[PDB]
């Protein structure tokens, strides 16, 4: 019955402004202080700000003090977070969190919202490059060979990677993306196959990046190397 309902993925430019919200129900909203807690990609939980039940007192982490404003509407049970002067390092999931107890002090959270990803970046939508990672003597360990596709320079996430339109799945590894210094993402998807049948089996990686309506089919062929 206690629900905290949040917004969705949003893109903003560094220096930009964004207002994130959380609609609450199933409890006396005005009695509870509320917080925003963020999580940067692959990082731990970071408390951002809090606001008392009535809104007379607001608290902020030093990292956001003069840039973020917490507020609430106790008429329509809504929590807000105005984020001005945004920076790349504010890229994170933002969760609304209701205090466990009605007390004035001791902010710890019994219910959480599903989170809202806020991405701060001066990058434009771009489809990936798809290069083959060719099997060879140097990517062969006895009876097994490795091959793959390097899915590079794309923005924003996600990108999906299938092999042989879904027919190939055992031994597949699509690595998590890494953000490059350029502000574009890159990942590689690899697969282990029998090296004995490299000259006979065909391997195609099917790369799809919905933001830029990109759907690439790249045949991965062997190279002598040695």
């Amino acid at each position: 019955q206690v629900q905290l309902v949040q917004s969705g993925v949003t893109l903003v430019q560094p220096g930009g402004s964004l207002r994130v919200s959380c609609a609450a129900s199933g409890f006396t909203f005005s009695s509870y202080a509320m917080s925003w807690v963020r999580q940067a990609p692959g990082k731990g939980l970071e408390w951002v700000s809090a606001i008392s039940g009535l809104g007379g007192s607001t608290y902020y982490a030093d990292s956001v003090k003069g840039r973020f404003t917490i507020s609430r509407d106790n008429s329509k049970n809504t929590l807000y977070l105005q984020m001005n002067s945004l920076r790349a390092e504010d890229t994170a999931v933002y969760y609304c969190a209701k205090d466990h107890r009605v007390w004035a002090a001791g902010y710890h959270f019994d219910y959480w919202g599903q989170g809202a990803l806020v991405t701060v970046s001066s990058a434009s939508t771009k489809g990936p490059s798809v290069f083959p990672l060719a099997p060879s003597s140097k990517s062969t360990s006895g009876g097994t060979a490795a091959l793959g596709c390097l899915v590079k320079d794309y923005f924003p996430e996600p990108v999906t990677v299938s092999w042989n339109s879904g027919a190939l799945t055992s031994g597949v590894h699509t690595f998590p993306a890494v953000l490059q210094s350029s502000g574009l993402y890159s990942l590689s998807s690899v697969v282990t196959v029998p090296s004995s049948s490299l000259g006979t089996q065909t391997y195609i990686c099917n790369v799809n990046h919905k933001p830029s309506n990109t759907k690439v089919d790249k045949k991965v062929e062997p190279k002598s190397c040695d």
Partner: protein, 213 residues
Amino acid sequence: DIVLTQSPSTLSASVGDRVTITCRASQSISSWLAWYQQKPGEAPKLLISDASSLESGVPSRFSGSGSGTEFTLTISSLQPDDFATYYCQQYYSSPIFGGGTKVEIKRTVAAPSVFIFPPSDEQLKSGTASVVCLLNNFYPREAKVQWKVDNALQSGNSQESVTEQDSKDSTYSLSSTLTLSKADYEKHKVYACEVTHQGLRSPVTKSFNRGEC
């Protein structure tokens, strides 16, 4: 303001183990500490409040103890549903979280299979050279990957990515990607990936010669 430190940062446990996670505060917080559990793609879940008060619906398996600057979350006998990250959080002053402790699936040592990929000619036509070194199906996570070009140790021109533990075999896979410009890639001959892992009797080096590859 109040720094919370968790030890260990990663806890390799097997099902049925008695698991202990400690939280150390920079100053006394009396007993105003909470513990949360978080799995990937999910919001945290409150387990314990006021250092030892177990949240409703939380299994009896989980228990909390401590006060002042030392607190401990204990799981009596680990279950499959307990592999996750656990965070401590103080609320004596403005709230702060600890860094988190990942409870991960312990399995037996598995040496990595090392593979190396030269840059394709198509990428070289675009002006960039990406050299990919794959360490496949290994355990534990700890591994050292060094890039050498004409026996010159490289630093800061490669970034790595690791998969989450495999559903079937609980192993990890890792990719190390060295990136250069094509102009710079063409100035060197030998490209080597040296892998140091506790499952390998000695370091494995996968290398190629630019020209032959």
